[PDB]
CSV table of N, CA, C and O in Angstrom, one decimal:
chain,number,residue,atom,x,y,z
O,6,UNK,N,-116.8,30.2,-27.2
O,6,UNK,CA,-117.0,30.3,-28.6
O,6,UNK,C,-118.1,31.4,-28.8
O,6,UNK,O,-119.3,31.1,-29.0
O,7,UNK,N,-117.5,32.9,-28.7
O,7,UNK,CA,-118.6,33.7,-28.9
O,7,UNK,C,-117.8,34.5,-28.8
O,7,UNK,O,-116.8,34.4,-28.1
O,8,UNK,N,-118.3,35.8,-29.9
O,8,UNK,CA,-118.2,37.2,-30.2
O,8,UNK,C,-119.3,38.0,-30.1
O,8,UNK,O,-120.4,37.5,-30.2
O,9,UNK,N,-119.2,39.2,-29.9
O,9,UNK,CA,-120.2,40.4,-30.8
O,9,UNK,C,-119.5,41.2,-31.7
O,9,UNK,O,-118.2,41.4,-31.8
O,10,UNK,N,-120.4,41.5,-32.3
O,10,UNK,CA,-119.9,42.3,-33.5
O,10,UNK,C,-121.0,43.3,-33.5
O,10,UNK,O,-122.1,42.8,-33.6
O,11,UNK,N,-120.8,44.7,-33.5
O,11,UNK,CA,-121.9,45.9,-33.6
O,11,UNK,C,-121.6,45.9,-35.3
O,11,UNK,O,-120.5,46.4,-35.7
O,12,UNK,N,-122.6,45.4,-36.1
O,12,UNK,CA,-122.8,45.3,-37.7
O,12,UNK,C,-123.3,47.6,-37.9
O,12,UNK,O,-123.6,48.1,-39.0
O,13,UNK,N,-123.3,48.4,-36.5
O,13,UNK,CA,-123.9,49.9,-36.9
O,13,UNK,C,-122.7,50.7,-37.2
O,13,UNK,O,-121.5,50.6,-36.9
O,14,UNK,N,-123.6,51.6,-37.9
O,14,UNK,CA,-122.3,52.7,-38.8
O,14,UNK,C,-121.1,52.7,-37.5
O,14,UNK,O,-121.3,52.0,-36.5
O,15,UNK,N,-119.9,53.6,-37.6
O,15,UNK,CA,-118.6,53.3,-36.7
O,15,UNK,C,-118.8,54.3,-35.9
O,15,UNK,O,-118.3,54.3,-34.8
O,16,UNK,N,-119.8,56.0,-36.4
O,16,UNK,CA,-119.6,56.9,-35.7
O,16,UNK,C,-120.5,56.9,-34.7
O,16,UNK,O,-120.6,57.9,-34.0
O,17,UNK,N,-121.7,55.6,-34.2
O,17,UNK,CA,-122.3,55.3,-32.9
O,17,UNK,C,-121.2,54.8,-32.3
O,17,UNK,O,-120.6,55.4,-31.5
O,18,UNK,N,-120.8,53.6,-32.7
O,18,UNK,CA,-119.4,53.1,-31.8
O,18,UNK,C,-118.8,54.0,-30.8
O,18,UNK,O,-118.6,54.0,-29.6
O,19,UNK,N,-118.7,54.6,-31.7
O,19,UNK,CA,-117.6,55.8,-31.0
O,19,UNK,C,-118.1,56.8,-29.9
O,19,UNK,O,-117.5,57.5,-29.2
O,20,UNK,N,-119.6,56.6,-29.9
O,20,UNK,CA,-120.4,57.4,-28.7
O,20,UNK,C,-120.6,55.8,-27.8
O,20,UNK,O,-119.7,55.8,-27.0
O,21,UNK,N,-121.0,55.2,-27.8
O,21,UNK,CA,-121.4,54.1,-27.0
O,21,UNK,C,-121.5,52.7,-27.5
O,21,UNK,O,-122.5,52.3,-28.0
O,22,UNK,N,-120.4,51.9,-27.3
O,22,UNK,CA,-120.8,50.3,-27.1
O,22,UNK,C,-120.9,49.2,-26.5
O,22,UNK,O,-121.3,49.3,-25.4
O,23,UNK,N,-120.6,47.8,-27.0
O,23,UNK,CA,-120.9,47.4,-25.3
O,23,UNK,C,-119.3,46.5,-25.1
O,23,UNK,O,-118.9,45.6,-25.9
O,24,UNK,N,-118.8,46.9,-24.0
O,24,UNK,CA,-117.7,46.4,-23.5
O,24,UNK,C,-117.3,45.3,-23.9
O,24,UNK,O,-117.9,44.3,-23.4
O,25,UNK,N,-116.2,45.1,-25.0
O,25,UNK,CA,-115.3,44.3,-25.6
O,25,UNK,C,-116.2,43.8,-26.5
O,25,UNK,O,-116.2,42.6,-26.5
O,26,UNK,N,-117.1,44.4,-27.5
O,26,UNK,CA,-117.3,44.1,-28.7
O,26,UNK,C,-116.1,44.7,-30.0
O,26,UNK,O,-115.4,45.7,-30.0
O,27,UNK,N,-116.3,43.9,-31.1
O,27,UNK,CA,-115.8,44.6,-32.0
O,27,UNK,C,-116.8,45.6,-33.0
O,27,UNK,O,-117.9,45.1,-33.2
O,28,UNK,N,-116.5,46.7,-33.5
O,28,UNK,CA,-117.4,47.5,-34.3
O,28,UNK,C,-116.9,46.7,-36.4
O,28,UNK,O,-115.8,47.0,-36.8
O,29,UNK,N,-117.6,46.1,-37.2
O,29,UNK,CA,-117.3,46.2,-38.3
O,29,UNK,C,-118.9,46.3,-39.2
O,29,UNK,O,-119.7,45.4,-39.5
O,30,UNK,N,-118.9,47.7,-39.6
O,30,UNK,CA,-120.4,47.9,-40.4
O,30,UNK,C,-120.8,46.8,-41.1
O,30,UNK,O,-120.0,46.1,-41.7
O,31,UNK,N,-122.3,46.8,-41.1
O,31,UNK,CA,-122.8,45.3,-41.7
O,31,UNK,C,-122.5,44.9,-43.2
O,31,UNK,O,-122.7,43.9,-43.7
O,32,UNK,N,-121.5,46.7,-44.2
O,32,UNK,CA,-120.9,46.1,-45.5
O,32,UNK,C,-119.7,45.5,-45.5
O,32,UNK,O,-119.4,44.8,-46.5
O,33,UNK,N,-118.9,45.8,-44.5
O,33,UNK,CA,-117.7,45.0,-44.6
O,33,UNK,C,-117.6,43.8,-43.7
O,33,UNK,O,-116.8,42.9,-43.7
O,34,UNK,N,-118.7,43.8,-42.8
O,34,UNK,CA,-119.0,42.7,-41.9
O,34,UNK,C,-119.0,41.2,-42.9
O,34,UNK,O,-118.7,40.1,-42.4
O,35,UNK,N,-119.3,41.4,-44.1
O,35,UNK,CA,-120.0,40.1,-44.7
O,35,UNK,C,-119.0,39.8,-46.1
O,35,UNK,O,-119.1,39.4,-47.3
O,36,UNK,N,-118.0,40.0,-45.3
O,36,UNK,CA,-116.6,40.1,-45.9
O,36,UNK,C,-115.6,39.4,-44.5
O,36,UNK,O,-115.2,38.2,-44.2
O,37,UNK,N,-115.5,40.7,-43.9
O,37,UNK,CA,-114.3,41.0,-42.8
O,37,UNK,C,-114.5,40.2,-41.5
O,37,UNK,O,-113.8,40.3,-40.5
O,38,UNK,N,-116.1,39.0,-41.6
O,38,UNK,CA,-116.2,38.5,-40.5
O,38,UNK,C,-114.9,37.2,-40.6
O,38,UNK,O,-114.2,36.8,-39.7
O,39,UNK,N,-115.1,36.8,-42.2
O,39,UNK,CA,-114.3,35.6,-42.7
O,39,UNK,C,-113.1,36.1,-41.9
O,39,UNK,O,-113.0,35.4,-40.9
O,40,UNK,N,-112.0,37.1,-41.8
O,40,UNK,CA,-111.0,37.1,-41.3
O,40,UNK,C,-110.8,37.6,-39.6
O,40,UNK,O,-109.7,37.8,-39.1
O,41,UNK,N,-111.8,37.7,-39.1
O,41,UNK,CA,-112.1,38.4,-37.5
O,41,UNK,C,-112.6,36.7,-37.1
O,41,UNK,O,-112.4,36.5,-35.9
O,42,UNK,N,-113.1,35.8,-37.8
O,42,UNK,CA,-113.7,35.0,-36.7
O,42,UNK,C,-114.1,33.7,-38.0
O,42,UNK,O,-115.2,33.8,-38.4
O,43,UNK,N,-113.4,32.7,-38.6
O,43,UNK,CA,-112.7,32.1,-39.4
O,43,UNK,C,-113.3,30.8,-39.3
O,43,UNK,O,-113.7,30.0,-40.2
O,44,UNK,N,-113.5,30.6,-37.6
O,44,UNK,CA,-114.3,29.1,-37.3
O,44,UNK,C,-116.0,29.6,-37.4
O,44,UNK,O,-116.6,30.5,-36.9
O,45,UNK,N,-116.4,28.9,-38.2
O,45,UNK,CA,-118.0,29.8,-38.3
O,45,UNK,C,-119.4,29.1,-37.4
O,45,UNK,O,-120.6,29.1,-37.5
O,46,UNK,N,-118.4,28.3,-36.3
O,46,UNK,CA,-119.4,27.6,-34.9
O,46,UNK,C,-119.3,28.5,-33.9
O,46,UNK,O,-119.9,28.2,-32.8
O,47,UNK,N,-118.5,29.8,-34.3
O,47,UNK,CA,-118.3,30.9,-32.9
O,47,UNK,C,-119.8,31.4,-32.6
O,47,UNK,O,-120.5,31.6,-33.6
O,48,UNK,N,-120.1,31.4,-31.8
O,48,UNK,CA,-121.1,32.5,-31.5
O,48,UNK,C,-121.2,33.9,-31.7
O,48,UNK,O,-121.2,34.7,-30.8
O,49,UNK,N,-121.2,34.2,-33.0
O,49,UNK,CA,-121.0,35.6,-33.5
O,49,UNK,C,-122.4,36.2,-33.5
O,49,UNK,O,-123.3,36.1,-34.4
O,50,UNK,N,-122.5,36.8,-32.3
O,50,UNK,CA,-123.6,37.6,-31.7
O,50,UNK,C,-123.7,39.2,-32.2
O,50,UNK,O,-122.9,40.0,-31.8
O,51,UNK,N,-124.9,39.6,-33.2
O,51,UNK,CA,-124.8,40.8,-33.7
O,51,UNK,C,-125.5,41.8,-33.4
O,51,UNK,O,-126.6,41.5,-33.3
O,52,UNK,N,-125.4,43.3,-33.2
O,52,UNK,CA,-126.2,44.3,-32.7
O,52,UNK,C,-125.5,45.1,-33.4
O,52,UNK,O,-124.4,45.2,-33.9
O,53,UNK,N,-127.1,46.2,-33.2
O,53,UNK,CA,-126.8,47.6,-33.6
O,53,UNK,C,-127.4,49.1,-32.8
O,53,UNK,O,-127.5,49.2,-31.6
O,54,UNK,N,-127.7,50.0,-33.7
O,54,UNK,CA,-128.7,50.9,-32.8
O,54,UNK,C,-130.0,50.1,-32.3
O,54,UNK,O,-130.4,50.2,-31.1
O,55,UNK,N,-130.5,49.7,-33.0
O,55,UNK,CA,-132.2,49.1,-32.8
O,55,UNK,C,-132.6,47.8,-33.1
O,55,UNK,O,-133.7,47.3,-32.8
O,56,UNK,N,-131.9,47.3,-33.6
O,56,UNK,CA,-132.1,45.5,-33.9
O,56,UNK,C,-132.4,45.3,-35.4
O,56,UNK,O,-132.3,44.2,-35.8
O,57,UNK,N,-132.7,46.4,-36.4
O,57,UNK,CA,-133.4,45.9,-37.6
O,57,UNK,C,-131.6,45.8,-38.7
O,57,UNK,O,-131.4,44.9,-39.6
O,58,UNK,N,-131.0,46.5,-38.5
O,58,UNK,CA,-129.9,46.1,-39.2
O,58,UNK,C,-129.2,44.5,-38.8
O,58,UNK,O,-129.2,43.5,-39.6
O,59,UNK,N,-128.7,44.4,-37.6
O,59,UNK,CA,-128.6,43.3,-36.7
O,59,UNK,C,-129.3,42.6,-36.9
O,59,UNK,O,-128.8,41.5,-37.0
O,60,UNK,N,-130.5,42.7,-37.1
O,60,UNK,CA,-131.4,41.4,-37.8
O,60,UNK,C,-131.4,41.1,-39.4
O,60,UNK,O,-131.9,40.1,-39.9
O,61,UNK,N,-130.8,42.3,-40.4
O,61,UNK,CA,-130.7,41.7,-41.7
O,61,UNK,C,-128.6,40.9,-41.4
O,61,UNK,O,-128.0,40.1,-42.1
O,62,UNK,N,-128.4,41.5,-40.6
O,62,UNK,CA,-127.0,40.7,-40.0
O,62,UNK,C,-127.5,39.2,-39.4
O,62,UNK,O,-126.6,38.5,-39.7
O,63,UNK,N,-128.1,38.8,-39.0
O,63,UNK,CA,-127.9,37.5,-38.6
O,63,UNK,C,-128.6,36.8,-39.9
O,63,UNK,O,-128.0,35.7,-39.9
O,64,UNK,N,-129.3,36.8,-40.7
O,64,UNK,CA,-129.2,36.5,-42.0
O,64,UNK,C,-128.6,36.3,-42.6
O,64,UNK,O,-128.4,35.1,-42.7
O,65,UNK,N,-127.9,37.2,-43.2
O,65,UNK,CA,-126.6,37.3,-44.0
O,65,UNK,C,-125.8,36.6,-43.4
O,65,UNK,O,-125.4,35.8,-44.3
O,66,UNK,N,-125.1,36.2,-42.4
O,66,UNK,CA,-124.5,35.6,-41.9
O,66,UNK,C,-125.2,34.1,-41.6
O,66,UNK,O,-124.4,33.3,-42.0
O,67,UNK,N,-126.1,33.6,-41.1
O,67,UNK,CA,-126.4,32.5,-41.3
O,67,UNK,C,-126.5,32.4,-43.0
O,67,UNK,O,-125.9,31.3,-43.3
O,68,UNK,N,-126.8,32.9,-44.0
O,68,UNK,CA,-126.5,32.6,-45.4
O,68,UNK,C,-125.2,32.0,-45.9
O,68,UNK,O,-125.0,31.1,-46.7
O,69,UNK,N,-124.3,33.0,-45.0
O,69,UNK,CA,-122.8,32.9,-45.2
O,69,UNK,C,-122.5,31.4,-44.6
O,69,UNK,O,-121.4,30.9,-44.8
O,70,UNK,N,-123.2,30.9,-44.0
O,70,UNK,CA,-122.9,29.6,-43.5
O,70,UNK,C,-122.7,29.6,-42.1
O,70,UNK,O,-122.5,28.4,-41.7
O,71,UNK,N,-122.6,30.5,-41.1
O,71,UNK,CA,-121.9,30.5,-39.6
O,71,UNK,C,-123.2,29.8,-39.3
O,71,UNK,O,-124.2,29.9,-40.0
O,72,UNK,N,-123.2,29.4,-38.4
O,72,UNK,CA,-123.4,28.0,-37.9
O,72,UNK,C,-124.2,28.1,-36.4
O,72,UNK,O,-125.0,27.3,-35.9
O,73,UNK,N,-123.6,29.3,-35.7
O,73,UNK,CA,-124.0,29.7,-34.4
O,73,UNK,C,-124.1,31.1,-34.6
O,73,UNK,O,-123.4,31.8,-34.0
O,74,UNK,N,-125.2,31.8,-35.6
O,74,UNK,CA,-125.4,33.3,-35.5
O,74,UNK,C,-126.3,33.6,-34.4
O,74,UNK,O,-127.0,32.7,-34.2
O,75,UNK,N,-126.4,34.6,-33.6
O,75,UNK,CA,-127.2,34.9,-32.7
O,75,UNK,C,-127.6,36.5,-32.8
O,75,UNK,O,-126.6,37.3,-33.0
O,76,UNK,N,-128.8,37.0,-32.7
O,76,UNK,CA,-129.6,38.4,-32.9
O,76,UNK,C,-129.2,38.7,-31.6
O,76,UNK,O,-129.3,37.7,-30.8
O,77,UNK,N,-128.8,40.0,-30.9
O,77,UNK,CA,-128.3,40.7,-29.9
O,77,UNK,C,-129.4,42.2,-29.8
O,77,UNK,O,-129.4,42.9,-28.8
O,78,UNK,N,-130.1,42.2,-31.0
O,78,UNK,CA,-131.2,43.3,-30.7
O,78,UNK,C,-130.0,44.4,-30.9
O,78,UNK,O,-129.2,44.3,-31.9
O,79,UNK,N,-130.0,45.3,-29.9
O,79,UNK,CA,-130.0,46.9,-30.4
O,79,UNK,C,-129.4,47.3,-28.7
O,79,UNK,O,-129.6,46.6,-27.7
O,80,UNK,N,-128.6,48.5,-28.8
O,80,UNK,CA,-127.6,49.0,-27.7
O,80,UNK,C,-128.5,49.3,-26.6
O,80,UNK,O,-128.2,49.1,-25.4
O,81,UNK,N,-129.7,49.8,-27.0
O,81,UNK,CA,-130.8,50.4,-26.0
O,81,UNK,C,-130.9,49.3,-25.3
O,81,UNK,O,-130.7,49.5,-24.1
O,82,UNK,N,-131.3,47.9,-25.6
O,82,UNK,CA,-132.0,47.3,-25.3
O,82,UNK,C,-131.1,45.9,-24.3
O,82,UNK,O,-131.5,45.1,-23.5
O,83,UNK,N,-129.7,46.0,-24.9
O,83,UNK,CA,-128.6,45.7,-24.5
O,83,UNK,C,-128.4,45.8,-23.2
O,83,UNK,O,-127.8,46.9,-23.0
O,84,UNK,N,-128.6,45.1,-22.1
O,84,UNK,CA,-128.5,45.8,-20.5
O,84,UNK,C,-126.9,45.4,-20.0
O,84,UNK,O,-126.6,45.3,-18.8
O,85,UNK,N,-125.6,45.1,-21.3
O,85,UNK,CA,-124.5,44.6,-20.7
O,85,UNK,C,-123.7,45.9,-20.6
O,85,UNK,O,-124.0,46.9,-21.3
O,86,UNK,N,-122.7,45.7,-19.6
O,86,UNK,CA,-122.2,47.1,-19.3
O,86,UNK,C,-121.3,47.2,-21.5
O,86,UNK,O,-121.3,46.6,-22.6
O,87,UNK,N,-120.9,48.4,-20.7
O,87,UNK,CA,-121.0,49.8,-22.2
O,87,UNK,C,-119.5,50.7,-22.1
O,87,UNK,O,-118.9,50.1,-21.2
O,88,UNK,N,-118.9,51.4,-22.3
O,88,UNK,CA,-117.8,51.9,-23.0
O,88,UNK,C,-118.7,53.0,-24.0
O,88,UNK,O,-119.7,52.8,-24.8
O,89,UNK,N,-118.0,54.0,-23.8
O,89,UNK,CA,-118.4,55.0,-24.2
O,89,UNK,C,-117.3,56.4,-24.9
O,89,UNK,O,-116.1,56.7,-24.7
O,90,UNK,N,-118.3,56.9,-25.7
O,90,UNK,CA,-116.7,58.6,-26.8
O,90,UNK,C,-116.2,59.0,-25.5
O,90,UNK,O,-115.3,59.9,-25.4
């Protein structure tokens, strides 16, 4: 029961993320998670460039009601392997 989700703009994605996340920006995220991930006990684990978007993401989403949000910090800081442009 766990996801990531990179809540950062799509055109970092596209230079570096981290292996088998999904990319959905933190404005459609708080929409598009309802249909990406439906049971809201998943571990929907959020990151970005640096952690501060990612941290108004685990917010918003604990607001939204998910149940198991988890802060992932930021790509730098992220030591799981990566996928890259």
């Amino acid at each position: 029961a766990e996801h990531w989700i990179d809540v950062r703009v799509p055109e970092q994605y596209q230079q570096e993320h981290v292996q088998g996340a999904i990319n959905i920006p933190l404005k459609e995220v708080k929409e598009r998670i309802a249909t990406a991930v439906p049971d809201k006990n998943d571990t929907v684990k959020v990151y970005c460039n640096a952690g501060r978007q990612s941290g108004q993401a685990k917010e918003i989403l604990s607001e939204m009601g998910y149940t198991h949000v988890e802060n992932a910090g930021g790509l730098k800081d992220i030591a799981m392997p990566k996928v890259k442009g």
